[PDB]
Design a protein around this ligand. Sequence first.
Ligand code: SF4
Ligand code: F3S
Ligand code: CL
Ligand code: MG
Lengths: 264, 602
Amino acid sequence: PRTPVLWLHGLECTCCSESFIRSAHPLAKDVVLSMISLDYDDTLMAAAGHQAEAILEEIMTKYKGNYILAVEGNPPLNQDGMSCIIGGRPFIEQLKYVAKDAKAIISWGSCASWGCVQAAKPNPTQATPVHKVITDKPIIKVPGCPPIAEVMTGVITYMLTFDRIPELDRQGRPKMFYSQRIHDKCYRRPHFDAGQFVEEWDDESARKGFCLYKMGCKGPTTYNACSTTRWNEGTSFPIQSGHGCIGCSEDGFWDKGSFYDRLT
Amino acid sequence: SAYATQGFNLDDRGRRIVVDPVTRIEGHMRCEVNVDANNVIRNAVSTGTMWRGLEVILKGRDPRDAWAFVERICGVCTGCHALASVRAVENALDIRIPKNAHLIREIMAKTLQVHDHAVHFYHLHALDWVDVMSALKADPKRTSELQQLVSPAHPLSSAGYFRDIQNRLKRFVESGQLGPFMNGYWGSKAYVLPPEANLMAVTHYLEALDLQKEWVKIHTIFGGKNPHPNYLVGGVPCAINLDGIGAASAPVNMERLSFVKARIDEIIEFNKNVYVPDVLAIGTLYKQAGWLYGGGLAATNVLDYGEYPNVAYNKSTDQLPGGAILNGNWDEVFPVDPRDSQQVQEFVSHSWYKYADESVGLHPWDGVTEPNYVLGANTKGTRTRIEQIDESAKYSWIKSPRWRGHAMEVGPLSRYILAYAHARSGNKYAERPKEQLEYSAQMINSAIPKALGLPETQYTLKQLLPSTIGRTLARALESQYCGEMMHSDWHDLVANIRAGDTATANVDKWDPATWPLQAKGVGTVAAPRGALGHWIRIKDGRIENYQCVVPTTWNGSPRDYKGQIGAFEASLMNTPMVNPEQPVEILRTLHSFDPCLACSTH
Ligand code: SF4
Ligand code: F3S
Ligand SMILES: [Cl-]
Ligand SMILES: [Mg+2]
């Protein structure tokens, strides 16, 4: 029997769900048909309304302490929680309810992990990451906006293969994907080491793939697999395509100053 | 109580039905309807059930950073907000971008159109038309025969192939863990397809799921990643070096451009061999069943800003020409000007926001976003447990955009109606959409019925297009047209590069010390779901105001000051339901707008 996943959505842009289906190894099709049972997910599920909500009750009962709760997005605490409404009630109530009997909780993306864009100043909805509301359950943070597809499916695959949470760092991120800074293995590192930098967009240095540090690249302070695993089956990553890393897997990256201001 | 608006007789005295959550959309929506004694919808209520406040968050920030913030309005229509934003800032600051940057943006935009459209149809919409359990009853041989009739050119057509797919679906269902198919509405009389049509569609659902990840690699080349590719005020960051020194390390070299063309060619094949034929066939069969409901405002009022100029910066050459049509008069298209304070305006009379004066609509340069979550006195339930929402008061996180006070439908269907009207008036740039529409009408009325042994019909485009079927058709045709267009864009890009113009960014006004101290700008995009605009005011190097009016804001809007209904609400009106507590028809029509609720509310 395949492990049930209940995939909830709070305040979000749905980038994590979209990234998930880009996975090539394994294919999202094979994950859904052969690895998990994706029993609730607003993006893809046939049932709506009362029929959708009934699924939660059924799976929680039959698979108590054996389903994975995946959360994309986050709960707002302002507006009496009704800046995110599900079934006429605050999303935070759904989150707490489904969390109670979960075997494990995955915080997908920077929204669920840290807050992401809606939590940037002045955070009008008081959007709050999952671990600050659910404080009694094991939570794995998979940050990034969105995370790499293979990172998402890689986390699921590990959990299903071993029935264990992968080794986490102090911030709750899986070390198998988040142990390295982008800057460690970035292919532009030899230019950085030789002081070869882009100074203006589309200058001669940019056309030669020089380092993007002076254009604001946050690779040196950002932990992710972007330089090595890369994006969309290793086709590129932000730096290869010519834009500095904006630090999108790091807590509070929206409020660390302009993306184009260099690290000091 | 009952009232008439826009030729619709709203009546809230019947049986109330609640659908919350509305699933197979992006984001969060609640829908309520009232049905009469005969199960016909006579009232419909669209409630956007999320808000994040991007417009508030943007205040005080650097305009050069804005695109990345607003890109995160939505990961489904990923990039279209970034495009609107850079366009708005470039408009405010009088920045002219290089030709290659324009073409790369166009290729990225058209890639999104195809990806978004095809994924919407198969993964979000198809289950409103296709009964997956019925697919299990199909004959593999007859499915092969159907595939060959529907699309001869598609190579995946053998009986053994369909048998293999059917067998895997069987094993999946027989496991008792139905996953995304759990608690579905299978077997409802609202489903009309024969088993073979269902199996063919489910097979393509799986095919599209595997292929969609390939198309977006075009975004990955030019923008680093998908979802959320990177953009740039003044051009694109993907500097070009075809084969010169450092070319291997450059964002764009010749090998990477060849790769993009390969992906484009695959898209062309998918649209013409899989997506368009499936929609024509499914549309034909539902037409034959008489399911022509869901026209709503499409029968009268449609709008788009117009996009994709043949000649850059020459709007008369738009390949999806826009404007506004009113009262179903396809003989006159009014120009739409996003700068005109009397044209695009947003009301909040029935929205959870506040203005100084809510009897008026604000143009987005003057827009205000202050939350005001409060429920009407006729609400059933409490502030945190809504049982029945009170649509006489404030009932949605979505504002109410109107054009010169008129409620409009936006989207691919609106663009195709506008394109048809332009082409009829003698606009040559709109000839392809016109050709697609006439071909489609012939296929749906005559060619596919004859092939399937069904009676022929004589619906005019005027009768066929304003319907949920028509809205679904236009999206598929638009996908095909966008693939064709970016195929041409690719050639134009490579030609320009080879001619010696390799520029990708204008940096003359990158430094804020070069900016006017005050400025306003607007950027518009023909986004996958319709007319998108971003309106910005800049003061002393910072964002003073940033207002977004997004396609699903138009379509999903609640009632305005005058009580006029928006596109979602109008489309649900006058629709019979087989079973009032199974929302099949509600989902089918709502999904035909491809609702993006995160977009609608931002
Ligand atoms: S481009 Fe960014 S991550 Fe790569 S070497 Fe330069 S600073 Fe480091
Ligand atoms: S912006 Fe995000 S996607 Fe990777 S390169 Fe930087 S962590
Ligand atoms: Cl964050
Ligand atoms: Mg807005």
